[PDB]
Each structure stands twice: as structure tokens, then as C-alpha cells.
């Protein structure tokens, strides 16, 4: 008898515990998709910046600046 | 009798241990997926700010630039 109550609770959890994982995996996904959205954004803004400054500085100027 | 017993409560409980690792092997098997996607997107844009900065900076100047 306690196999029985045993196998009830069981399927009940396991039924329970897919759902949440599933759905956690798609909003996990989505996450994803909006930060590497954001990423490469922020990384293109920053190598138009600096190919924008270095076009206007030119490399012969940082070539011994720096130094 | 208590071989009997025995017999019961682990036949029920190796069903449940069954379930329960299948489904714990499927959602790791999503969170490797997502994992993986992470990891190549965010290295593709590190990747490509690194390559389009060294094209704007051009080889030359780095090769006296860091030293």
C-alpha cells in the first residue's frame, strides 16, 4: 500500500516538475536572445566609435603617441 | 516475509528513481543546448569587435604599439 501512495505522489511531482522546468527553459532562452542582442549592439556602437576616432586621429599620429 | 517486503518497497522505489533521473537527464541535456548557444554567440562578437578594431588600428601600429 505504500508503493501505491508512493507511485501516486510520484507521477503528481514528476507531471509538476516538468512543467516548471520546461517553461523556466523557455523564458531561460529568451533571456538569452535579448542579452546577446544587447551585446553585440553595445559592441558595434563601440567599434564604430573607435574606427570613427582612429580614422580621424590617423595611425600615424598613435603610432608614436602612445609612446 | 521480509524478503517479500523488501521485494515491494524496491520495486517501488526504483521506478521512482527511474522517472525522476530520466526527466533530471533531459532538462541537462536543454541546459547544455542553451549553454552552448550562449557561449558561441557571446565568442562571435567578441571575435568580430576584435577583428573589425585590429582592421581599423591596422597591424602595424600594434606591432610597436604595446612595447
Known sequence: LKAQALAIETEAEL???QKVRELE?????AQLEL???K???L???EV???KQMTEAIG???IRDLAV
Chains 1, 2 share one sequence.
Not at 527553459?25 to 532562452?29: D, E, K, N
Open 39 to 41: 551585446a553585440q549592439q
Open 35 to 37: 542579452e546577446v542582442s
Open 25 to 29: 527553459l523557455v523564458y531561460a532562452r
Open 15 to 17: 507531471q509538476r516538475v
Open 48 to 50: 564604430k566609435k573607435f
Open 59 to 61: 595611425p600615424s599620429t
Open 43 to 45: 559592441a558595434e556602437v
